[PDB]
């Protein structure tokens, strides 16, 4: 019961890189650049009510 802090401080205290923060903690999507194609990968059917 003292002054609280967000959990990314203790989570990054295990030598846990911000790349690993934004990769491992959440399931991501990809996109292609540099070729003016403007395309992505296949859909993971993750949308239900959005």
């Amino acid at each position: 019961r003292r002054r609280k802090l967000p959990a990314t401080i203790i989570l990054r205290a295990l030598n846990y890189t911000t790349e690993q923060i934004l990769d491992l903690f959440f399931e991501k999507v990809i996109f292609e650049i540099r070729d003016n194609k403007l395309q992505m990968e296949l859909v993971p059917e993750r949308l239900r009510g959005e």
Binding site: R1, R2, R3, K4
Partner: protein, 104 residues
């Protein structure tokens, strides 16, 4: 947020800590007051500057030893609000220590 709602939440967390710890002594009450002023702090910056903009607070303070010496403004403001909350929770928990013993 206003000063009154933040102070109500402050002694609400204080009386929850008293109900959790069952503190009777005044010398043990003071450490609970310091830990409760350490608790219940806002993380919105607009609420922190709204405590500084609301009534019941002054620019000049009594003690200057608790005032830190750094380039961080939010640390100095947090120390000033912490000192004000310790003083105010002591002044309004001196009666609450008797009220809690007279409830149960």
């Amino acid at each position: 947020m206003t000063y009154n709602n933040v102070f109500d939440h402050a002694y609400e967390m204080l009386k929850e800590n008293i109900r959790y710890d069952d503190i009777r002594d005044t010398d043990d009450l003071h450490d609970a007051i310091h830990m409760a002023a350490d608790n219940a702090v806002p993380h919105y910056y607009a609420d922190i500057f709204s405590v500084m903009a609301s009534e019941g607070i002054d620019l000049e303070f009594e003690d200057s030893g608790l005032m830190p010496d750094t380039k961080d403004v939010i640390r100095i403001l947090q120390a000033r609000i912490y000192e004000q909350l310790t003083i105010d929770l002591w002044e309004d928990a001196e009666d609450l220590l008797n009220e809690y013993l007279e409830e149960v």
